Design a binder for this molecule. Structure first.
Ligand SMILES: *[C@@H]1O[C@H](CO)[C@@H](O[C@@H]2O[C@H](CO)[C@@H](O[C@@H]3O[C@H](CO[C@H]4O[C@H](CO)[C@@H](O)[C@H](O)[C@@H]4O[C@H]4O[C@H](CO)[C@@H](O)[C@H](O)[C@H]4NC(C)=O)[C@@H](O)[C@H](O[C@H]4O[C@H](CO)[C@@H](O)[C@H](O)[C@@H]4O)[C@@H]3O)[C@H](O)[C@H]2NC(C)=O)[C@H](O)[C@H]1NC(C)=O
Ligand SMILES: *[C@@H]1O[C@H](CO)[C@@H](O[C@@H]2O[C@H](CO)[C@@H](O[C@@H]3O[C@H](CO[C@H]4O[C@H](CO)[C@@H](O)[C@H](O)[C@@H]4O[C@H]4O[C@H](CO)[C@@H](O)[C@H](O)[C@H]4NC(C)=O)[C@@H](O)[C@H](O[C@H]4O[C@H](CO)[C@@H](O)[C@H](O)[C@@H]4O)[C@@H]3O)[C@H](O)[C@H]2NC(C)=O)[C@H](O)[C@H]1NC(C)=O
Ligand SMILES: *[C@@H]1O[C@H](CO)[C@@H](O[C@@H]2O[C@H](CO)[C@@H](O[C@@H]3O[C@H](CO[C@H]4O[C@H](CO)[C@@H](O)[C@H](O)[C@@H]4O[C@H]4O[C@H](CO)[C@@H](O)[C@H](O)[C@H]4NC(C)=O)[C@@H](O)[C@H](O[C@H]4O[C@H](CO)[C@@H](O)[C@H](O)[C@@H]4O)[C@@H]3O)[C@H](O)[C@H]2NC(C)=O)[C@H](O)[C@H]1NC(C)=O
Ligand SMILES: *[C@@H]1O[C@H](CO)[C@@H](O[C@@H]2O[C@H](CO)[C@@H](O[C@@H]3O[C@H](CO[C@H]4O[C@H](CO)[C@@H](O)[C@H](O)[C@@H]4O)[C@@H](O)[C@H](O[C@H]4O[C@H](CO)[C@@H](O)[C@H](O)[C@@H]4O)[C@@H]3O)[C@H](O)[C@H]2NC(C)=O)[C@H](O)[C@H]1NC(C)=O
Ligand SMILES: *[C@@H]1O[C@H](CO)[C@@H](O[C@@H]2O[C@H](CO)[C@@H](O[C@@H]3O[C@H](CO[C@H]4O[C@H](CO)[C@@H](O)[C@H](O)[C@@H]4O)[C@@H](O)[C@H](O[C@H]4O[C@H](CO)[C@@H](O)[C@H](O)[C@@H]4O)[C@@H]3O)[C@H](O)[C@H]2NC(C)=O)[C@H](O)[C@H]1NC(C)=O
Ligand SMILES: *[C@@H]1O[C@H](CO)[C@@H](O[C@@H]2O[C@H](CO)[C@@H](O[C@@H]3O[C@H](CO[C@H]4O[C@H](CO)[C@@H](O)[C@H](O)[C@@H]4O)[C@@H](O)[C@H](O[C@H]4O[C@H](CO)[C@@H](O)[C@H](O)[C@@H]4O)[C@@H]3O)[C@H](O)[C@H]2NC(C)=O)[C@H](O)[C@H]1NC(C)=O
Ligand SMILES: *[C@@H]1O[C@H](CO)[C@@H](O[C@@H]2O[C@H](CO)[C@@H](O)[C@H](O)[C@H]2NC(C)=O)[C@H](O)[C@H]1NC(C)=O
Ligand SMILES: *[C@@H]1O[C@H](CO)[C@@H](O[C@@H]2O[C@H](CO)[C@@H](O)[C@H](O)[C@H]2NC(C)=O)[C@H](O)[C@H]1NC(C)=O
Ligand SMILES: *[C@@H]1O[C@H](CO)[C@@H](O[C@@H]2O[C@H](CO)[C@@H](O)[C@H](O)[C@H]2NC(C)=O)[C@H](O)[C@H]1NC(C)=O
Ligand SMILES: *[C@@H]1O[C@H](CO)[C@@H](O)[C@H](O)[C@H]1NC(C)=O
Ligand SMILES: *[C@@H]1O[C@H](CO)[C@@H](O)[C@H](O)[C@H]1NC(C)=O
Ligand SMILES: *[C@@H]1O[C@H](CO)[C@@H](O)[C@H](O)[C@H]1NC(C)=O
Ligand SMILES: *[C@@H]1O[C@H](CO)[C@@H](O)[C@H](O)[C@H]1NC(C)=O
Ligand SMILES: *[C@@H]1O[C@H](CO)[C@@H](O)[C@H](O)[C@H]1NC(C)=O
Lengths: 321, 172, 321, 172, 172, 321
């Protein structure tokens, strides 16, 4: 009398295909997905402080476009810019707009400190019907439109020392009138100039006269510039016309703040990773949702699926007829 | 209609093994039985879990980066930005592809290995009391009831007690 | 009586060396090369539309340098610039030349639409002996040299709305005269200016007076600028002198077009991958020919050879004396 | 001048095997012969071809990128451009080097494995009728002519029919 | 207090083996001894050294690159610079992590393999004169003094000279 | 009578943990470190020629700031800038400072060739008490401060042809006076201009009038620009005021030169790899010291340790009670 002892392994009726160095297609017993390919379509407001810009770009919030007044002294981990955003103040452009947007977004804050600037010989608080705040004409909340007083516009020459321990960000502008008549009615001189300087940097802009396309009533433009002042250093503003003056500085920070263009709705939920598509889970090493991410996110990858085998090769059972 | 006959792992799986990854089937005096081997099953599962917990762990946290979509044509700087991101993405896509290929190849190999290791250990226990049929099964050359089979499975089989009975069946 | 059954594998007399994790040198039976290291030296004109610029740069084709007239309304998948290329029109420079070249090359087309520009009060179609077309003086075909009429040069102020569904690319310039006498003989005013604007962008250039190196008869220069106008948006040109006017716009496209500097001859043959060295096959995953490629190409790599084993270890047969 | 004597795969190759990668040599009553094994040969070739068709497949199609040679000195932007391309090239050169090293290591291992697997299967067929000489060869302990050898090679060898003759030669 | 009894490599190491990586322990008529195997020890060491000399060799020489720290906030260009370097560093950190994981996995496997290969070769020499105890040790079924053991270790063991004595001990 | 032959492997009492694909922690017999994590803190002056800038930036050495005079005609493989560096000449700024620093550092040399420039009608060798050399007022050694002679400042118009086989680097500047009174006292004209040109490039700068922060006595500034002249090409300088003239050119080279910011002391020792932390050995494939390196260096990596197994798995010996 004898006995038969067989050794064998399990197999399933529902196998799944994976890749190896050798095969494009091996059936194994079990597998797990490594590519996150789905999003709810919503951005979770936990744990990152999400700031919905609504109808305002970060730049328009920075300057003080009236319908963006709600964003004064605001902070964020991630600023969200909507496609529905619109400017509704003075027609403006920003040379190297992208850099200004970037540095402010990274700073993560619109904390503004008003400074006691003194503008002798000139009229202050200029307004326009292109930039209404309330019933009447107005202007960027953070900017001061300076014009002639009487029949004179003197050479402005002012100082603001930084005796703090942080960097000051100064936002200022230059007015480009559309006519020589406009150029002499506001600032008297035939051609103005704006010089803003620290001890190691200077920017002089000469305003340009010319008709630009009609925008909110106007063919004139304002060009926006910025200046960072380090501790110990000092700001000097010199101009004989066309100065769009700062009212103080923005406090600069370093940290984890950024900005994202997305139309995804903000939702009360929890997620570390944010894409413009919406929040995605971070349990998988890879994701195919968006190359644009913020936070603890899986690495973006071109594959929509990568299957990691979690079981042995699936081998069918033999039966002789 | 060959029924009741059992066969081992050689080019053959068991769909009826549900409480383990590896195990035993036997035919003796008391009929036919099956039992899973927890040790080998556990060994494989642990290795699978080790690899999984190395890959699924430690997400990279990133914050302010570069812009990756653009509403205006600009030229040189934007060319460089897109090229940087495209370079990065192709390299991570490659790492992802290579990673799963290596891991899956190794997964299949380590699971085959566990099966073979269980087979070798069982043969080691049996000494001269059994012969390899060449289908992943042993022919035990002595009376081996359910308690005898179990002693092989739980690793306490005493080959001396059956040795003489086995040699006579094998050789004479 | 017995028998001897031996199991063994093959081996060859011509083995080849490969690398592993362990060895720098293992002999195996067979191997294949993974690095494409060779080119015919010729660029295949199938399946990519190759455009040989011959004696013309893309920029000179764009502007309308007479000896590049053959390239009007031209298209390409890949533009090829030769080292023999030369400019033979008005002496010019392009601030951010590389960006203009890039965007036009990527657009892939020189399709030009003439627009009914109206320049009241000024003389049009200025020419120079530095830029001959036919027997007499001429100019860039796509540009319009404007000067004074009578003893006056008025403030030009014109509009071109984009009511199409595509982007318009406008090429324009500013004249830099070499003398104040030249500056007043052409444009009357002591200092001109050029302002080109959309609703969201403006560029004002103030021409510079000065002697530059003698080029094709001239010490004066023209600086080339560009402006893209999106659908819905509008172009405005304002100037009181030195305007080198556009004659219309270039139609902009998105797609697979590019540009390459190469002296490799174009040949009637078929190849997906193009290097400046010439076309290369794409059967191998890697190539060492050139980091500059266009099309379906192997990835550039520093190694001139990588040998993939396609056979087992080559083991010599034993013989006892 | 030891001639005619055959030896197996142990630290030894066969230059005379031309119609296969793996195979048999035998010495019996009817002399000396050789035959290739198609199955094992095919198994290895298929695996080699699988790896090859994974590497040689799917070229990346690229179009407008960044400039990579420069006729002028410019500084910062050009520094970044060159650094981006040099970074990319070193990373792909590394992937290329690692890839072939891994693939070739695995190629050598899978081909060794096929040889061993053919040896184990042949041993499994032979049961108690043969002994391993330790040179990749079996000593068949019974009369085994060309038809007997062929039955081993084509996998239909009936060990029972030779078993008793073999044990007497082996043991007595 | 089980002392003097020897055991092999099965889930067991030898802290007393200092002149080799692999080797022999024996119990015979003349007592108990131990000897290292130089060949297998050398084989492993060579493979370790091959991998080491591939990784530690060929440093990359770089010169003028891009700036990587910045005293001023600038925006776009600096964003791109940092992003390029951070992209590069994460990719090399990944290669570094994967490299050592692969190499160490292969190191452990090749060293296990050498042990097993020494065991199989020893079994091959012994033929029918020994049985595998299942603990990495052989029971030699004949008188085998220190010279007999040494002939096994130095690979000149003549199994015929002991074969008949061994079969009687094994079977009868 | 029988015998027992056991096969086994060694093990050690001092094992060490490594990682695999599977385990975070396997004990093996031996391991080696692959990440260089340490530096002596000193930069070895062999085999790279290290140039300690001491109190001078590369730019200040380039221009000729008096306390940097020691660095004239100097060469280097690696220039080292200290944090203690200070400027002590005329207050200046460099538009695209980083690019000028980069290209000079890469060129690797301050070899200056004086050229016979002729400045007719103007006063030369202007000096300032902000830039003393010796007891009295002075200026950048490589620059020539030009002012009016008598009551006139003529239109300067000069040439320098490059008939050499190398590239010439020209350093020049524009003066920005702080007052209109300063602007007319030095250069007569109400507004100067500087035009520097080759046959393919031109740069015209219009000086800006304005008070900047007080620096070493001054509120005026000089802006520094550069021009490269290829062989065959030619330099032309045109100005009617505010020209800060070159005195010749710097010889440009290609090669392995660079620059590094470090306060690490230079030491007499030998090392191929340099970090700002100091020299590091290059025996290990990876390093965690600094992402900034120069020379034959290990690749920078985020891990502070990576352990390569150099021995088998460490398995404990069994003992039954
Ligand atoms: C096909 O192949 C896949 C292999 O990938 C396999 O799927 C796997 O199946 C596993 C077995 O079930 C499963 O592992 C389990 O996960 C449970 C989830 O709970 C916990 O998940 C966290 C991960 O982020 C973990 O850190 C934490 O412990 C979680 O619970 C607790 O923390 C969270 C937040 O931190 C909190 O919200 C929870 O409230 C809190 N728990 C409580 C009670 O308060 C584990 O819980 C579970 O644990 C089991 O094992 C442990 C020890 O091993 C024991 O302690 C415990 O009692 C359980 O026995 C277990 O680890 C994998 O998640 C799953 N993977 C995937 C990708 O899906 C398939 O099963 C396989 N198919 C077949 C047929 O084989
Ligand atoms: C050392 O190691 C290397 C291993 O790399 C090995 O070299 C390999 O040898 C292989 C065997 O000969 C060889 O494979 C063959 O390739 C033939 C080429 O024709 C086809 O190539 C295309 C690849 O792009 C393929 O897609 C297509 O089928 C091609 O033919 C057809 O399409 C093209 C365009 O698409 C068209 O122009 C052709 O006209 C059209 N054909 C026709 C008739 O109209 C294959 O054809 C060939 O096929 C063989 O196998 C097939 C199934 O396996 C059968 O259908 C067919 O009948 C053949 O039997 C086969 O696949 C590798 O190319 C070669 N590799 C390299 C890198 O050189 C060495 O042999 C080895 N040395 C030793 C001594 O072992
Ligand atoms: C744990 O695991 C690690 C494994 O990494 C292991 O550490 C290793 O141990 C090895 C064995 O001792 C050791 O290898 C030795 O290195 C010696 C160093 O000298 C030479 O190093 C240079 C490397 O850059 C080499 O190119 C050159 O030959 C060096 O000597 C000569 O050149 C230099 C400059 O080029 C010059 O300054 C010297 O003066 C000049 N020499 C002379 C005399 O003028 C080697 O010398 C040594 O050689 C030995 O083997 C050779 C052949 O194999 C023989 O020729 C020679 O006689 C020696 O026998 C040997 O190669 C590794 O360096 C070491 N690695 C690490 C990372 O530390 C541990 O031992 C292990 N632990 C345990 C317990 O196992
Ligand atoms: C240089 O060239 C540019 C471009 O050609 C000129 O810019 C144009 O300026 C004119 C006005 O100066 C713009 O014309 C229109 O003005 C209207 C307001 O004035 C009208 O309003 C009263 C009632 O309040 C009417 O009775 C009377 O007709 C007045 O003329 C706006 O309401 C117009 O809006 C139009 O455009 C929008 C959107 O396009 C439409 O939806 C409206 O229905 C309406 O059609 C318009 O703004 C004209 O728009 C300007 N064009 C551009 C391109 O900016 C410069 O004036 C010129 N400079 C000089 C010195 O000549
Ligand atoms: C500011 O400074 C710059 C540089 O010093 C001056 O630019 C130079 O301008 C002069 C002319 O104004 C250039 O001189 C030469 O002019 C010749 C044409 O005029 C001559 O032709 C007639 C016959 O038609 C002759 O009889 C008579 O001599 C005329 O003078 C060209 O033919 C010359 O070509 C030369 O150069 C080429 C290549 O270098 C050679 O192959 C030729 O054989 C020939 O030698 C030349 O162009 C001079 O070239 C200009 N130099 C530069 C660097 O541009 C400005 O004029 C000056 N500005 C002011 C206001 O003074
Ligand atoms: C536009 O606005 C700017 C900024 O407000 C003005 O710039 C300032 O200019 C004044 C002088 O014009 C600077 O004042 C100081 O000048 C001193 C030298 O003059 C004094 O020296 C004599 C002795 O030699 C004294 O008896 C007498 O009081 C003189 O007034 C310097 O010694 C001063 O140094 C100070 O600063 C340092 C560091 O900050 C301190 O350590 C010193 O102890 C001392 O306090 C100082 O330079 C003033 O600094 C300038 N400010 C800035 C920000 O640059 C422009 O003048 C103005 N333009 C016009 C046209 O009005
Ligand atoms: C299977 O293994 C178990 C665990 O080693 C053995 O355990 C015995 O189980 C019996 C029940 O039949 C108990 O009465 C004993 O107390 C256990 N013995 C010991 C030594 O722990 C069991 O014997 C094994 N199976 C067989 C059939 O022997
Ligand atoms: C080798 O294998 C083949 C295929 O299994 C066997 O095929 C037989 O070939 C003989 C010729 O000698 C034919 O007459 C039979 O029809 C085949 N038999 C079967 C069952 O198909 C062949 O027998 C094997 N070689 C030997 C020596 O037995
Ligand atoms: C161990 O191997 C060695 C080398 O093959 C054998 O060498 C013999 O050593 C003896 C000493 O006992 C010498 O007298 C002989 O000259 C050697 N013989 C040969 C053929 O070289 C040695 O015999 C082996 N050990 C044993 C116990 O046999
Ligand atoms: C197979 O089916 C079972 C039950 O339906 C399920 O639990 C298991 O996940 C499935 N496996 C795969 C690989 O789909
Ligand atoms: C060996 O030579 C044969 C015939 O000459 C050839 O077909 C084969 O490709 C060669 N192999 C190698 C690896 O060179
Ligand atoms: C260029 O295209 C325009 C319209 O597409 C056409 O009117 C003109 O004739 C074309 N020029 C040439 C040379 O084909
Ligand atoms: C173990 O200790 C010995 C002697 O103390 C030493 O030579 C060896 O390097 C140590 N090994 C490890 C892995 O620390
Ligand atoms: C600088 O070099 C020039 C020529 O190469 C030479 O005339 C001059 O004297 C050098 N200056 C110093 C300080 O060595």
């Amino acid at each position: 009398s004898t006995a038969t002892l067989c050794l064998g392994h399990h197999a399933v009726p529902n196998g799944t295909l994976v890749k190896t160095i050798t095969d494009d297609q091996i059936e194994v017993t079990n597998a797990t997905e490594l590519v996150q390919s789905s999003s709810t379509g919503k951005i979770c407001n936990n744990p990152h402080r999400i700031l919905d810009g609504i109808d305002c770009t970060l730049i328009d919030a920075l300057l003080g476009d009236p319908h963006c007044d709600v964003f004064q002294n605001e902070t964020w981990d991630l600023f969200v810019e909507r496609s529905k955003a619109f400017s509704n103040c003075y027609p403006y452009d920003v040379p190297d707009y992208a850099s200004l947007r970037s540095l402010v977004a990274s700073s993560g804050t619109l904390e503004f400190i008003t400074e006691g600037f003194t503008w002798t010989g000139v009229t202050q608080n200029g307004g326009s019907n292109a930039c209404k705040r309330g019933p009447g004409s107005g202007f960027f909340s953070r900017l001061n439109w300076l014009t002639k007083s009487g029949s004179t516009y003197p050479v402005l020459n002012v100082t603001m020392p930084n005796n703090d321990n942080f960097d000051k960000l100064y936002i200022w502008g230059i007015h480009h009138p559309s006519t020589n008549q406009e150029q002499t009615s506001l600032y008297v001189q035939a051609s103005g100039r704006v010089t803003v300087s620290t001890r190691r940097s200077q920017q002089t802009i000469i305003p340009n006269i010319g008709s630009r396309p009609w925008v909110r009533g106007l063919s004139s433009r304002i060009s926006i510039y910025w200046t960072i002042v380090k501790p110990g250093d000092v700001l000097v503003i010199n101009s004989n016309g066309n100065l769009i003056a700062p009212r103080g500085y923005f406090k600069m920070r370093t940290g984890k703040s950024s900005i994202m263009r997305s139309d995804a709705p903000i939702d009360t939920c929890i997620s570390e990773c944010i894409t413009p598509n919406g929040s995605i889970p971070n349990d998988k090493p890879f994701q195919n949702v968006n190359k644009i991410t913020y936070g603890a996110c899986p690495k973006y990858v071109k594959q929509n699926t990568l299957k990691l085998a979690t079981g042995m090769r699936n081998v069918p059972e033999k039966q002789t007829q | 209609g060959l029924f009741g006959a059992i066969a081992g792992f050689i080019e053959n799986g068991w769909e009826g093994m549900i409480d383990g990854w590896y195990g035993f089937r036997h035919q003796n005096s008391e009929g036919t039985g099956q039992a899973a081997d927890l040790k080998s099953t556990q060994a494989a599962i642990d290795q699978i879990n080790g690899k999984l917990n190395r890959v699924i762990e430690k997400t990279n946290e990133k914050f302010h980066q570069i812009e990756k979509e653009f509403s205006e044509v600009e030229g040189r700087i934007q060319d460089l930005e897109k090229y940087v991101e495209d370079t990065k993405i192709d390299l991570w896509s490659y790492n992802a592809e290579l990673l799963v290929a290596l891991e899956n190849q190794h997964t299949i190999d380590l699971t085959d290995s566990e099966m073979n290791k269980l087979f070798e250990k069982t043969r080691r226990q049996l000494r001269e009391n059994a012969e390899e049929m060449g289908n992943g099964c042993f022919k035990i050359y002595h009376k081996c009831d359910n308690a005898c089979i179990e002693s092989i499975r739980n690793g306490t089989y005493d080959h001396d007690v059956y040795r003489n009975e086995a040699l006579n069946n094998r050789f004479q």
